[PDB]
Write a protein that binds this DNA or RNA. Sequence first.
DNA 1: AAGATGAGACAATGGCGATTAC
RNA 2: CUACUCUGUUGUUUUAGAGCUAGAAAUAGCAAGUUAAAAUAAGGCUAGUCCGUUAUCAACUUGAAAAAGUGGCACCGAGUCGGUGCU
DNA 3: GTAATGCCATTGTCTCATCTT
Length: 1353
Amino acid sequence: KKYSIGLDIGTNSVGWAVITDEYKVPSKKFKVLGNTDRHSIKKNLIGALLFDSGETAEATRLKRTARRRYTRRKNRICYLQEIFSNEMAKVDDSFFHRLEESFLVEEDKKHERHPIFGNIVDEVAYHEKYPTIYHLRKKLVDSTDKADLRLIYLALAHMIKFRGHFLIEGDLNPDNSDVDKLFIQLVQTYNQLFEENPINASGVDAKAILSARLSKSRRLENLIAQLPGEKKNGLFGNLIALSLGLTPNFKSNFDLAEDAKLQLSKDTYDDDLDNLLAQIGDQYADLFLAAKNLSDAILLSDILRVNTEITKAPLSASMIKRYDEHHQDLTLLKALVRQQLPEKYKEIFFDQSKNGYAGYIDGGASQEEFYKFIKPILEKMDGTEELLVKLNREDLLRKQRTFDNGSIPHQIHLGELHAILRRQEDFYPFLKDNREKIEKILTFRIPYYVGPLARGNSRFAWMTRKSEETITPWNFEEVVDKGASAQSFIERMTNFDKNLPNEKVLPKHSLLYEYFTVYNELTKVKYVTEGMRKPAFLSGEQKKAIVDLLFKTNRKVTVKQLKEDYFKKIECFDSVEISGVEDRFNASLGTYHDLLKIIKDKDFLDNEENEDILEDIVLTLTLFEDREMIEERLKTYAHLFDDKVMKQLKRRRYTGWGRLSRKLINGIRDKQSGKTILDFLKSDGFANRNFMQLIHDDSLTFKEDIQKAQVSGQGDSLHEHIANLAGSPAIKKGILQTVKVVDELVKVMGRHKPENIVIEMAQKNSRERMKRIEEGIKELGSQILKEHPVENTQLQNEKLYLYYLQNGRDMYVDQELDINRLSDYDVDHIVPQSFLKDDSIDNKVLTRSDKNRGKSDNVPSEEVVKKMKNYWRQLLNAKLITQRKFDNLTKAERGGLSELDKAGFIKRQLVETRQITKHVAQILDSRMNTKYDENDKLIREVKVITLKSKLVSDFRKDFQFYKVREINNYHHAHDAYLNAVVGTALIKKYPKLESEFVYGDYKVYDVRKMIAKSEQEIGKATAKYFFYSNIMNFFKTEITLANGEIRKRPLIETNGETGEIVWDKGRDFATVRKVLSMPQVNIVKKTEVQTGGFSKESILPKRNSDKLIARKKDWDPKKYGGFDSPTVAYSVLVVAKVEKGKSKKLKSVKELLGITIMERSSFEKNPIDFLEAKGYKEVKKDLIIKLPKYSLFELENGRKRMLASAGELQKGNELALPSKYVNFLYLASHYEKLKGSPEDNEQKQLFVEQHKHYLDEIIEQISEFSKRVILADANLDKVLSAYNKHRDKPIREQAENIIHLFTLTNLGAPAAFKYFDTTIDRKRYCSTKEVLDATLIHQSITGLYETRIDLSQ
DNA sequence: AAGATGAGACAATGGCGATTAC
RNA sequence: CUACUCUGUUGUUUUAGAGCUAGAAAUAGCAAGUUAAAAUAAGGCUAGUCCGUUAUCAACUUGAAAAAGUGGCACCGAGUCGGUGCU
DNA sequence: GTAATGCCATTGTCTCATCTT
């Protein structure tokens, strides 16, 4: 029995269906295991696996690095105590011991409750003498007297524990720290990036402006006032606003559609910066980097207020001044409030719940919340000067430990540490002996390229050891093989090219890469002069001349500079027109101009012998960021340069990686031509092929070379094949599940492999079209928006959007369209639906009658093209229409549609562009087909067909097999079935087109033979598959062309070459409808142990509740607080006995106990001991059942539940709504947006109106389903009541809201939903009792093989 | 008319506590 | 398009920073607050300045584990699958 | 006393209304 499998792979579901030769879904009897009376069940071979999305490893990575940081910080403190130990033992015996046990309460604390001195008197004296640690630090830096060793340790430990950032390398100096130098660097980067209309800031006094004590916005405005050519909303103004701490919007600066806001203080700035940079290119990356540096400088000046130089510790003195000012402002505030506003004093200083001062100090109230709370209070009170100016300047009652301290470099803390060590050096000899040791503890930082200092038991570590001793900050240089460690780092961090494995990818800023992309963008440029009247691609000599003369002289090349300074200057061409590019060249030779600015030797940059040297330099600067390792890897080229520019070269840094390798760009060579990819880009004769075309085109050896190396890089296991794929972990999980589903399906069919496996990979728009309309209108100059104003909400209508796209004019006739008579007007297709199924705006026009297109079934005639070509050219250059639409509109002037165009349409409909789909097909093909013959040829028994979603979607829309995702989860399985049907139909109808869809080595049939010329009526003497280029015409009974003639096709479609019936237009559509109507579809929720964090991360205060979880073994949460809300890994049905407490009373209980993630290892180590520790006795070990999340139970009347938890359930049933209601809902909800022909649209609308009683019937279906299964009668009553409340509303709205009503009945967790204004809150199933007497159903991945256990026992 | 800030609603399911009802 | 290394600042939690005056308390009037220690997934053995939140996971049999095995075919129907013949 | 009906969480984010430029 031959069969085929259809698959719909997604990130949260995998649809699957099995079809026969007559497009039927088999129904089979499957054995049922367990201990019930049901031994067989009938199931349809169609279903869908559902599963939670796979997660990325980012969060785990962050947590891991955080753990490492905490560990290493604690180790730093342990090092400091190790240095201090013997002399602290001589001074105080239990000092460090008291410091470690500071957290414990006095009952559990073995030593005195007072940490530092152990007696209350000395503690009071210390705190009064030093109320903050910065007081002690400033004293120890500015006092020559001998100090107590405990206080010295406190200062050093505070400076080491919170040591500051490492963003600045080397000693602190004005070149990389003062605001002025970084401002000059910012305007230098700005002028370098533009140079046309640059900003000159020679006169500015950046220090006096940026460091001045004023509000942020007023400082920004004051700096803008000093630059008359720039404004606050300019790019530079937005950069300064970003550097000062404001939230500037860069949307207007780059005309981006979506608003991109950046805030340096926000933790999510980097990925936001990566999104923005992705939109505008990485040329601005270093610009924003300089802004960040400038921000830190400004921040450092905001903290380093005490610049008077009378002290040696600027930071500690500044914190003292902040303390004093805080004290003054506090006492003044209390005085003013008590004087003027006696009432509400308690709300500010005692209440603490509403963000008062007590909330600012003792409650969870941030600085911005406290300021926001006290701003109106200060405004209302009198005598509040000198506090509001501080509040607006964000310097009122500041704490010493705030979010600003991230900007403090570690060289300052190092300075204060050096000062303290030097002051107390002679008094304590071991400080003199261990000065460099302590300094090394503060300054030592494990390099990125060394990584975890493991000894073989770390999956993430790679470093090499030159000894066998504990790595410390002092012996790191002589124990860590930095050379070998850096080499391993290189070997690990080098990703391999997806096109060619086993070859390292070049850096993104490599010179050869920039040359490659520059030529790749330049080769798609076409020029038309005055006389030739036809587009001609640039020749090799032209490319070399333009590159050498223009691209090697300026960073930005625009079309105007290109035509003015090359074509007119050298080629003497007065007027040129360019279609390939829009405004400028996206590619650029950034690295070239960077190196030119560094070494200032233009001839050296163009010598082809020095290419490898420059590639080595860029690679070294890309891989590493540390100055020492860069100097080590750049020492070989010290003699080449003058050693002045070498310093500037070492300061340059590059980040990023490309996607292609050197061997692909300029390595592999065509055997016949003898030219590499780059050589083909530079020279290719008349026609110039781009990169993607060389990969696609089979006439060259490049495609063969890329294909033949794909299987070398692969591995042996399935896991390695899945890990090598290029996709998110979610789709990789879905792919693995798909493979397993295929394995089970071929097992179910008696180990018979299928014949075919068909695979499918499962307000902004209004803004884009609005910006498009506004730019087109502003460019043209017709003020249609003035006489007929519209908003982005109304622009969703097709006919109105087309009305505004066409300047309010008819496309075929020279007359204006009537704004308020669009119902009489028709929407025409530039390329008819009989040739290509393209219903986008790119191929649609609006006109009063589609008879104006003319009599031909092709593109519009030449008589209309000749009349309207000028107006279409004005709409073209005004960006109202695209280049392709203009090409299609004016195709009759060039003969009309051609065989190459029809072949392009066929390839557009039949080939899948996504690489991930091809790799999945490769995996399935390799796993399914594994036989050979005597020779070395692969026998392909199973064909893996790759299909596009558009085909099945159009199949649904054309024949009313409508999809409504909100009804149930059946649509995945249905999509898989329809994929199988369409795939099998296409492989049966057109076997010679196997190379388009089927994976593997096939004959590359040129499509020119297949396309029939001059309507040969698909003759049989010659092949002639089709005259009309639409592949899905044979499913249709009639074919309506663009003129109105209705062509007829036979009732039974058969293959021409083999005489096999491929589609019976009666029996097969009836079969498809019957399959779509089946109510039993196997929907399976993949059961999964829950993993991840133990609980909510919140560390809650102490409470009298046994739900609290201890943060450490001996930290009783009733005294110390802790975590609550643990996640249940899985539930465990246990049959056991418990003590009632009134007596022994071993009542035999049966209940689900949730094993939390934290408890899992202990429970699995020894379950019985764990359960006895929980209180259970005489546990029936053999009856314990492991129940992971989504475990399925069936109760009475087919009602089903899924396990969400140990104490909560989810809905387990699917609502098999009849097909007629699904189609009615789709039609009623899509009333205005039918997007079909007018007659067809009228038919659908009349069908909806004639069948409006289906609304009440659907409500009845939801009601009866809910009463049987859902059991939420309060919500059902709410629903029915709301439906009766809104029966007056239009049919469309009632349909749209019934769609929301199906959330009441959906499989999975209950969720709230809205019926018009009314909201129905979720009813949860917060009890697991009933499942203890239900039937548990263990399911295979396909759900076919079941095991039913009656838990009554 | 555009940009920024504040408030009311959405994500999105399960655990905790309170509540209420038998 | 994933994956990875180095690093910081906040935050939270207990304890320390003596509260003072009345009053049998309850509760009232005021003073004060900015800082610090320690933990920051419980923990693990392999004892490293390492690892612990990703991937993977129905049931049953054999195994410490990677992993191997276990479930008849047609026909008439179709409310979550039912019925009939052969085997 | 036991068993079935709103807030919080890595407290993010999006849209609408009002005020300011």
